[model samples]
Target: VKPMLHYFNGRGRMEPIRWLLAAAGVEFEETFIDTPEDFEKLKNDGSLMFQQVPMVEIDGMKLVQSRAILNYVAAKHNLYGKDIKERALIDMYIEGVADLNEMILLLPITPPAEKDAKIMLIKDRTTNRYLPAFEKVLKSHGEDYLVGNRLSRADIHLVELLYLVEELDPSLLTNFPLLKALKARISNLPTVKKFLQPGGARKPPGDEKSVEKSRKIFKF
Candidate 1:
């Protein structure tokens, strides 16, 4: 059964969930909240555990919280890890990259005046901090995968981050050979490859209309 996801038409928090499901070869459906009424209806109908979008209906359960939905999908699809130790490592790596994700996630709503500096900040932190950490991890293992030498949530999420950074600046990964390699490896996975193609579940980089719609609906 395909999972049903409820979220805005844009990526936002739901993008990673889309990536994870697609990378896992799981087909899912979407019900985009195109208006404030749809958002309110879900909240009023008790569909959301925390009165938020990015809700997923799967396995006879309604799951909210992006990370919880990610964990469930990863674990169910064998993308989490082989065991607890591997899971812990994956979690650690994910937590670190999450800081980078947070920075990128806010770009859509960033005011025009601060956009340039904010973009520069993201680039600086990614180069000096996040990319180097993942590069070191890859070097230490000399394996294709970030954890346990197999595809895990860490690999998927890292690749997603790489793309996000690339959108910000296409050359951001130039100095990090391992990270570039990791991107190539994870991206070419058959399922992920399909998702990357045009006209799939993947959403494009946020644009002006996207930003305005988000600001209106999210009230930010």
Candidate 2:
């Protein structure tokens, strides 16, 4: 059987996989878990004991956890790194992205009353602490790619995370030229670009605005 990725109907954490697969030219199935009935069934099954989507159905085995799937696909597709040290650096970048994603995962559970304040605080930390660190890394690289010379999973992960931030704040990426350039570079890849447009496997969970609008929507 071909590999299958199970996740919510929206991006959440599966988008990096979408980007990685697209960039690597591998084809797989995207399985969306967007309804309460089915999601609750998965949670009750105790298969995903921790209760999460983003599960992988590959090689006749089911794997839970997002990052492991990241490395799995990367290793299988030769998109991770050339050597141990190179893989180490790519791993660092992935962890950095995970750190940046704290807000992404945290916001939905935050009380609506506190959400705006939390966004303000997260945006500040991202600007003062996170973005600056990312910028410094890019500056240290001096040119092209976060680690090594070729594009890797790190690039795909970071771009998707950055795009998530851009979703929250309308005005972002203006100051970070190198990161913007990196985003542009990844965006320009043929298959990756194809996966980014409408009718692609990477439709993000609507942003707060759209989600709010959707809650007011009627679905059968």
Candidate 3:
């Protein structure tokens, strides 16, 4: 069976999975529950075993958990690590993005009240802590990738995550030359480049409006 990813119409947890498939040349269907009513029905049915979006069905099995799905597809496409050591490094890198994911949801959306206070709080930690860690990793590795010489899902995830941040501030990565260069590099990779080309799934299904909707339903 063609792998199917079920999520709201947004670039939520499933975004990295889409990158992996595009890299692996694995085409899959996106099953979107665009509304609350559709989502609830799928959740009640066996379709969503975990009562969540960002799940996938593959080879007669249902897989929940975004990281699990990510690792699976990355491993399949050789976009994971080469061995245990590399995999360990990749795992560490993923945790950094996970940190960004935590702060990002709360930071961006300007609440009617308590705007600057919270945004600055989140931004300080993100800019000071999480992003610095990424910069260190790139420098440590002495390579463009976060881990090992080759590309990894962690690398892809970082780029996508940064894209969302870039939407907020175009100069976000200007200080981090490595990430900025990688942002352009990864987006134009062979298979991904194709989808990102003209009429070839240049972007994922979700937009800004849907992105907020996705996070609420499918938290990191």
> Which candidate leads the pack in lDDT?
1
Which has the higher lDDT value, candidate number 1 or candidate number 2?
Answer: 1
Candidate 3, residue 5: the lDDT equals 83
What ranking emerges by TM-score with the best candidate at the front? 1, 2, 3
Candidate 2, which segments miss by more than 4 Å at Cα?
34-37, 40-51, 207-220
1 against 3, candidate with superior lDDT: 1
Write down the TM-score for model 3. Answer: 0.83
Q: List the residue pairs that clash in candidate 1.
A: none
lDDT tens per residue, model 2, 1-220: 6688877666666777777877788778966665566666767777574676678787766777877777788998887889999999888878878887877766875789999998888888778877777788889868678878887888888888888878888466778888888888888888788888887777765567645532332121
- Listed in order, each prediction's TM-score against the native is 0.96, 0.84, 0.83
lDDT of 3 at 48: 65
Quote the positional error of residue 128 for candidate 1 in Å.
0.7
Q: Clashing residue pairs in candidate 2, if any? A: 10-205, 11-205
lDDT of 1 by residue, 20-96 (tens): 99999999999998988888899999999889878999999999999999999999999989999999999999998
The window of 10 residues in a row where model 3 has the poorest summed lDDT is 199-208
- What TM-score does candidate 2 get on C-alpha atoms? 0.84
For every candidate, C-alpha RMSD to the true structure in Å: 1.1, 3.8, 3.2
